[PDB]
Structure formats: structure tokens, C-alpha cells
Design a protein around this ligand. Structure first.
Ligand SMILES: Nc1ncnc2c1ncn2[C@@H]1O[C@H](COP(=O)(O)OP(=O)(O)O)[C@@H](O)[C@H]1O
Lengths: 198, 116, 70, 62, 175, 230
């Protein structure tokens, strides 16, 4: 059979506008075009044979747990039937809550009120523009902070516990072999999770 | 393999389906096989109306819920033709050029208001 | 509306209040409850309910509807 | 809050809050970059395979 | 409170002295009552004179609302495309299949079970196996819509297969 | 005539404090969570920088009214100011300036400007023009009397929030009766005839121009009591 990577790349190129191009505004399309160049390079074929691996003996206990968590994330990306609902939730970020949505909405409302005060009073100056830009940057940084705080505080203990449970169940050698770039995703999709009752 | 096929891929007899008290609306659809395990788990695992309407992953009935979700998505996409509909909505020119669906494209008028 | 005199000879129920309403209510509730229980038993004597969940009607049983044999 | 599809209809689908796991930093090195590229390719191929299945999965039931 | 209001005055139900002869020409045309007898029917729109005049005025006034409805319908029809709705395509043997089966059964044209030589045609409500009217046209339209939807889905699947084959060939053609 | 003191268990005035959120009452006490209490308690507000920012931001003291008689700037050399809009004109100008941003902002931010137009067209035709657009069109923001040309120099608002002044013949001015202009502009006078005095409206007969003055506008007695304006 032909290379699945090349076939999928050609199909995606043909049907990207049929699956990923949505109807948006003028500025929306402009931003989407800016992001398209800014989008990372998705190479269908990846030269993974150039990697030089290191033994798990070099890694520490928390390092091995992190490697197992990374392998679990890679499997969840590849093998969608490996973990249970609770394990999948543990391995992924928590949903955005009322506090986060309200913070975003309050930042948007404050910006809207400031813009109304500016335009209605025609109070547009260099100082006002700089203050608005700084406020926008600070709001973006703070919105990224709540996600970071929630993700870290929640997942890191949960991820560590889940990895430690899976480390004893599967093995650090299996986890490192999954972390090794030489693994095949085709077999990784057909691999069975020993903790899956099915 | 099939979207409507259950994880174990077994066909339920009419006697079992009537014993499962599956809704006639579900029986009309082609996703009965997956809905059988989900219904069995839900009957075996009682959840309140607030619980079911509030639980996102459907609680314990998770794998059957995912299988039924896939089957129902396939059924609702096929019965509404929403796949080709969204395809033509994404790009009327591309769909007309590719000849994906002659019948769908021959009466495809996006409308002046909807971006002409 | 402001209450107005009504004929004592007239058998009217216009704003009629009985001081001994408690005993009358108790008496009209208890025997009525007994009669209702008897009627409920009589009605439940002949009842039809859908078959229980997980129970399938085997067509060979006489409980399944029958056909007139010509 | 739980049914914002009404807001998604009249006001459109606005910008959601930044939702990301940010868990790929568990390891370091070019292996991490290769894994990120593999994950991006996996997401793209998952989209393509979903399109292919939803296009061909109409004849599964007859 | 503050005033010992007397009993309700008897004037609250004044007695009507019939000043006009209730001619038999209007029998039951007036609801008779010892206090405030009334007409049998009420016309609170007495500003409208007659039934023909009232109908003309109502039809004149309803034109604005009819035009508003027409404007709404036009705004909807000039900004929307036909949708894809119909009977459940996966189930052809139900409401649709049963109709064709009954039309192919025609059991109402069989002989009597006891040899009475009387068929369903021998009745005021007699079976007719060749009606082809009423809801039959709607059933045919629903079947046509279901067939069109199924053909659209099949054509979409075939076109997707053709696209995949062309992509595979082009990837193979380059070598 | 309350008899609340007679009975002990009767509802007291101190209990009826949650009703202040819906029933307006004269101040009896300032709450701990009150904004005034928060301002007067926190030492952060006692800093000099906060006071300096408060004294040097928002509205300025110069633009605040200080007299019962005011004189606007002179449009020309020999003209005489007569009437001037104070707040209604400013609000109308702000509303007309909204289209200077919303129209481009929506054009660059709406996925379906065609849908936006198909929606707003009846809104202007049936609901907006008769409310705001035509009212501002007939609005007289400033009116002075130029004696050299014996004309009236009137500056009024324009669609995109602009200002435009024109000179009209005083002999072309006629008193417009509200009854004479009632029915033909019924919805215009119904929905948006509230802000202008229907008892005082003028008309330039040369081009059929309708001049409307705000019911709260400022009129100068010296200009009104002039030989040109009788
Ligand atoms: N028996 C009747 N014959 C004709 N018209 C009647 C009769 N009874 C009532 N009406 C109509 O009902 C209306 C009410 O009459 P009524 O109020 O009793 O007279 P008045 O207004 O002099 O007190 C009258 O205008 C009359 O035309």
C-alpha cells in the first residue's frame, strides 16, 4: 500500500477548505490568514531515525513518572480506547469554569467600557493608547495564568498518581519504549491497555 | 467496525429488544446495538434526572455512551445529509468543482445574506 | 363583598360556616376512604399491565393473543 | 451557561477561554519536538479520517 | 371601618319595567331577566355598522398585516436555502413500507371465509385497491424525498471514494 | 398614625433595611460595605497620587456651567447668536458619530454584512429614521442672525456626525403649525416629536426646509428682541 502519511497529507490539502475553513468576518479571515503562515509545519513524514535515546537509568523517579505521563498522553492521542473515563479526565486539562469565563467576560466588559469612554468623550491620546495596550497585555497574561494555575495544581498531583499507578502496572521500560521515537503508531493503536476491563 | 456496531458486535433479537424496553424512536434508527448496552447500564446504574442532565461523561456508562454517540452521530449525519450540507456551505465553488453531489449542488443557493 | 342578611328559611349555601366541621369532615373522610379501598380492590381484581422489563412474551404461551380457528 | 448555543447563533461562536493541557513539557529535547510534530500530524490525520469515514460510513447500514 | 355601613341596598338589583312590548316576532331574541335583561347576542364593535361593512373594513385593515407577513416570508426566502428533512431513511419498511404492502395485499378483495360469496366490495364502506389519491400522493412524495436523500448520500460516498482513489493515484503517479 | 409602639412583636424600622435596595429612603446609616465607607476607610485612597489623579481626570472644571446667561463663540463677524443647543445637540452628535465607527467596525467585523443590511434596512425605514435620523436632520443645533445679509446662519448635524452651517433668507421663514404638520409626519411626531417644541417650528420656504428647535434649547433675549426678528 501507498504511504498513509503522503495520502493523508494530499487528502488534507484537498479538503482543508472542506473541513477547516469556516465562514468568518473580514478581520477574522485576515487573522486566520496571519495564523496560516504562523501555523507550524505539519510534515506527513517525520525523520525519527536521527534521535539518540538515553536509558531510563539516567532519569529520576519524578522524571520517569513524567515520561510515563507523556507516554499516556501520546497513547490517548493515538489509542482512544486505552484509558477509562476517569483516567482520561485525569490525563487532560480540566474544563473552563464559571470563574474563568467570568474573568474573560469581565476583561472584555472593562475594555468595552474604556473604549466607550474614549470614543464618546473623544479622549484618544498616546497615554490612553499605551494604557489600553498594557491593560490588554496584562489581561491576556492573567487569563493564561488561571489556566496555568488550575492545570498545574489539579493535574500535576493527579497526573503523578496516575503515572505511578500505571508505572507499577505496565513498567518503566514499556513507558520509555513508548517515549522512544522509534515506536510505531499503527501498533500503538492496536496495543491493549492492561487496565481496560472492556 | 461499523459506526452502529457495538463493541462486542452482537445482534439483539426482537425478544431481547422488547425486553430492553428500548424506545420505538431508537428502534426506528439503525443504532440499536450500541444503545442496548447503554440502556442496560443506565437501568442497572440509576442516575437522577439532574444527574443525567448534568453528568458530562455519563458516569459509569462511558464506553457504551461513546459507542452510542458515534452511532447516533453517523445516523443523524446520514439522515440529515449534514455532511455534504456543511461541505457545500464551506465552499460552494469547491463542491461544484469536485462534483461531490450533483443533486445537492444543482439546487445549492447560499443566499445573498449568507455571504452571497 | 360586605355580607348581607339571607333568609333563614331559604336553604342557601351562601357563606355557610359550621362550627362542628371537624367531626363531619372526619366522618366523611373515613367511610369514604373505606369505600375507596373496596373500590380499588374491585378495580385491581381485573387489571392489565405491560410485561416487566427484561421479560419477553414467548409466543407459544396462551397469554399471547389467540386467533379464531375457522 | 450550560446552553450557550443561543449565544453561538445570534452573536456567533466567540473566543473561548485559553484551554490547554500544557503537559508535553514533561520531557525535554528534540524527542519532544518530534512528539509534538507527531501529535499535530495525528490530529490532522484524525480530521482526515473522520471526514473519510463520515463520507463513506453512509453505506454501513443497509 | 369607621362607618357603620348599612345592609346592601336592594337597588343593587333594580327591577326593570318593560316599557316596550316584547313582540312574539323576537321570541328568545332577548335574554329575559327580572334585573337588567339583555339582548341575546352582544356586538361591542357597534362602531362598525353592518356585517358587509364590517367585513370590508376588516379586509381593508388586514392588508397591512398581510403585507408584513409577505415581507417576512420574502426576507426569509431570499436569505435561506432548502433544508434536508424527511422520514427516517434507515427505516423503509415502517410507515412507508406498510402502505405499499397493504396496497399489494388487497386482502379486502378475497372471498368470504365461509363461502358467503360476499367480499369487502359488498359494503357501504367498501375496500378499494386502486384509490391512488389522498395521502397516497403525500406518501409518494415522502418516498421520493427519502430516495433523493439516499441517492445524495450514496453519491457523496462514491465521490469521496473517487477523491481518495485519485489522491492515491496522483501520489503513486509521481513515483 | 402608626400604632407600632403599642405592640412589641410588630415589625420595626430597623428590620425594614433590606427594602432600601428597592425602596428609596433618606440616608439613615452608611453600611460597612457601602462605597462611601470603603472610600473613606482605606488608606490607599489617602495617598496624594490618587487625589491628584482624581482632580486631574474625568470631567474638567472649565466646561461646567457657571452662569444663567452664556455666550457661545461667534460664527461670523457681524452675526448675532440667537439659539443654541446644550445637551440634546451633543447627544445627537454623539449618536450620529456612532456610524463613523460602527459602520466601518461592523464592515470589518461582521461575517454577514449582507445579513446586517437586510436587518437594518427596515430598522432605519420603519423604526430608526423616524426616531433619530430624521429628528437630527430637522434638528437646529445653533442658529444666529447675520445682519449683513439679513439672513439666518444655522449650523446643524449631518449623517456621519458632521457639522454644516447654511444661510437662509429671513423673509423665507414661516411659522409651521403643528396641526398643519401633524398627520403627514404622524409617526415622526409620535415616536420622536417629544424632543422638539411642536408649538414653535419654522420653515424656510425657498427649499421647503423644516427647522426644529429643542424644547430645552437656550434662546438669547437680545437676539430674539432684534429688529430683524421682531
Ligand atoms: N320589549 C322590547 N321591545 C323592543 N325594544 C326593547 C324591548 N326591551 C328592551 N328594548 C330595547 O332595549 C333598550 C333599553 O331600554 P330601557 O333602558 O328599558 O329604556 P330606557 O332607556 O327608557 O330606560 C331600549 O332602547 C329598547 O330599544
Amino acid at each position: 500500500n501507498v504511504d498513509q502519511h503522503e495520502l493523508k497529507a494530499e487528502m488534507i490539502k484537498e479538503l482543508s477548505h472542506y473541513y477547516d475553513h469556516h465562514d468568518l468576518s473580514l478581520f477574522g479571515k485576515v487573522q486566520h490568514f496571519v495564523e496560516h503562515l504562523l501555523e507550524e509545519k505539519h510534515h506527513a513524514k517525520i525523520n525519527t531515525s536521527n534521535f539518540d535515546q538515553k536509558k531510563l537509568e539516567n532519569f529520576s523517579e519524578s522524571k520517569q513518572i513524567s515520561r510515563t505521563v507523556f507516554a499516556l498522553k501520546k497513547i490517548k492521542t493515538f489509542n482512544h480506547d486505552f484509558f477509562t473515563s476517569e483516567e482520561e479526565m485525569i490525563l487532560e486539562p480540566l474544563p473552563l469554569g464559571i470563574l474563568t469565563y467570568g474573568l474573560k467576560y469581565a476583561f472584555a466588559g472593562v475594555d468595552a467600557a474604556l473604549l466607550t469612554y474614549f470614543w464618546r468623550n473623544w479622549n484618544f491620546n498616546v497615554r490612553t493608547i499605551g494604557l489600553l495596550g498594557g491593560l490588554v497585555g496584562i489581561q491576556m497574561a492573567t487569563l493564561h495564568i488561571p489556566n496555568l494555575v488550575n492545570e498545574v495544581v489539579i493535574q500535576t498531583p493527579r497526573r503523578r498518581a496516575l503515572a505511578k499507578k500505571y508505572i507499577s502496572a505496565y513498567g518503566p521500560q514499556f513507558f520509555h519504549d513508548i517515549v522512544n521515537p522509534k515506536y510505531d503508531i499503527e501498533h500503538l493503536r492496536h496495543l491493549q491497555n492492561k487496565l481496560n476491563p472492556y | 467496525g461499523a459506526w452502529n456496531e457495538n463493541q462486542q458486535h452482537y445482534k439483539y433479537s426482537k425478544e431481547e429488544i422488547e425486553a430492553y424496553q428500548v424506545p420505538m424512536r431508537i428502534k426506528a434508527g439503525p443504532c440499536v446495538d450500541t444503545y442496548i448496552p447503554l440502556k442496560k447500564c443506565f437501568q442497572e446504574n440509576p442516575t437522577s434526572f439532574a444527574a443525567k442532565m448534568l453528568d458530562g461523561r455519563k458516569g459509569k456508562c462511558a464506553k457504551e455512551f461513546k459507542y452510542y454517540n458515534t452511532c447516533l452521530n453517523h445516523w443523524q449525519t446520514y439522515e440529515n445529509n449534514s455532511h455534504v450540507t456543511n461541505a457545500y456551505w464551506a465552499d460552494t465553488s469547491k463542491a461544484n468543482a469536485d462534483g461531490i453531489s450533483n443533486t445537492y449542488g444543482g439546487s445549492f443557493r447560499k443566499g445573498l445574506a449568507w455571504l452571497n | 363583598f360586605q355580607k348581607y342578611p339571607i333568609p333563614r328559611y331559604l336553604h342557601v349555601g351562601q357563606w355557610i360556616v359550621n362550627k362542628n366541621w371537624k367531626w363531619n369532615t372526619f366522618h366523611m373522610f373515613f367511610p369514604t376512604a373505606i369505600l375507596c379501598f373496596m373500590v380499588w380492590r374491585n378495580s385491581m381484581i381485573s387489571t392489565a399491565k405491560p410485561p416487566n422489563y427484561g421479560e419477553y412474551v414467548d409466543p407459544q404461551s396462551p397469554v399471547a393473543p389467540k386467533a379464531i380457528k375457522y | 451557561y450550560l446552553e450557550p448555543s443561543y449565544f453561538h447563533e445570534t452573536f456567533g461562536h466567540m473566543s473561548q477561554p485559553p484551554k490547554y493541557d500544557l503537559i508535553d513539557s514533561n520531557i525535554n529535547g528534540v524527542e519532544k519536538k518530534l512528539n509534538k510534530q507527531i501529535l499535530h500530524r495525528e490530529h490532522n490525520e484524525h480530521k482526515l479520517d473522520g471526514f473519510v469515514s463520515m463520507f463513506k460510513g453512509s453505506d454501513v447500514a443497509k | 371601618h369607621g362607618w357603620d355601613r348599612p345592609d346592601v341596598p336592594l337597588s343593587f338589583n333594580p327591577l326593570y319595567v318593560h316599557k316596550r312590548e316584547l313582540s312574539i316576532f323576537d321570541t328568545n331574541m332577548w335574554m329575559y331577566d327580572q334585573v337588567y335583561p339583555e339582548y341575546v347576542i352582544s356586538y361591542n364593535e357597534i362602531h362598525l355598522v353592518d356585517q358587509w361593512k364590517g367585513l370590508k373594513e376588516s379586509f381593508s385593515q388586514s392588508a397591512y398585516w398581510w403585507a408584513m407577513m409577505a415581507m417576512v416570508f420574502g426576507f426569509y426566502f431570499i436569505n435561506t436555502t432548502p433544508r434536508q428533512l424527511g422520514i427516517d431513511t434507515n427505516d423503509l419498511k415502517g410507515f412507508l413500507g406498510e402502505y405499499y404492502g397493504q396496497y399489494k395485499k388487497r386482502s379486502g378483495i378475497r372471498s368470504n371465509f365461509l363461502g358467503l360469496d360476499v367480499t369487502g366490495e359488498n359494503s357501504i364502506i367498501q375496500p378499494n385497491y386502486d384509490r391512488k389519491n389522498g395521502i397516497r400522493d403525500v406518501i409518494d412524495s415522502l418516498n421520493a424525498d427519502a430516495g433523493k436523500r439516499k441517492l445524495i448520500n450514496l453519491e457523496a460516498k462514491n465521490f469521496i471514494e473517487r477523491v481518495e482513489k485519485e489522491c492515491e493515484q496522483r501520489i503513486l503517479k509521481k513515483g | 398614625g402608626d400604632i407600632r409602639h403599642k405592640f412589641s412583636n410588630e415589625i420595626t424600622d430597623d428590620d425594614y433595611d433590606y427594602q432600601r435596595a428597592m425602596h428609596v429612603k433618606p440616608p439613615k446609616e452608611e453600611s460597612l460595605f457601602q462605597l462611601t465607607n470603603i472610600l473613606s476607610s482605606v488608606p490607599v485612597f489617602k495617598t496624594r497620587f490618587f487625589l491628584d489623579f482624581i482632580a486631574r481626570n474625568l470631567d474638567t472644571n472649565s466646561a461646567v456651567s457657571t452662569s444663567d446667561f452664556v455666550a457661545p463663540p461667534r460664527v461670523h463677524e457681524n452675526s448675532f447668536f440667537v439659539y443654541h443647543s446644550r445637551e440634546l445637540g451633543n447627544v445627537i452628535r454623539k449618536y450620529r458619530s456612532l456610524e463613523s465607527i460602527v459602520l466601518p467596525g461592523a464592515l470589518l467585523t461582521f461575517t454577514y454584512p449582507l445579513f446586517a443590511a437586510f436587518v437594518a434596512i427596515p430598522s432605519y425605514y420603519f423604526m430608526f429614521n423616524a426616531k433619530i435620523y430624521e429628528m437630527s436632520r430637522r434638528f437646529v443645533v445653533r442658529m444666529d442672525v447675520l445682519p449683513h445679509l439679513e439672513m439666518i446662519s444655522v449650523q446643524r448635524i449631518g449623517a456621519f456626525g458632521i457639522l454644516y452651517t447654511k444661510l437662509h433668507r429671513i423673509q423665507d421663514l414661516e411659522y409651521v403649525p403643528f396641526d398643519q404638520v401633524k398627520e403627514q409626519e404622524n409617526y415622526l411626531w409620535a415616536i420622536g416629536g417629544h424632543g422638539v417644541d411642536n408649538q414653535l417650528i419654522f420653515k424656510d420656504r425657498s427649499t421647503g426646509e423644516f427647522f426644529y428647535f429643542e424644547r430645552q434649547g437656550v434662546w438669547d433675549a437680545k437676539g430674539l428682541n432684534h429688529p430683524l426678528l421682531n
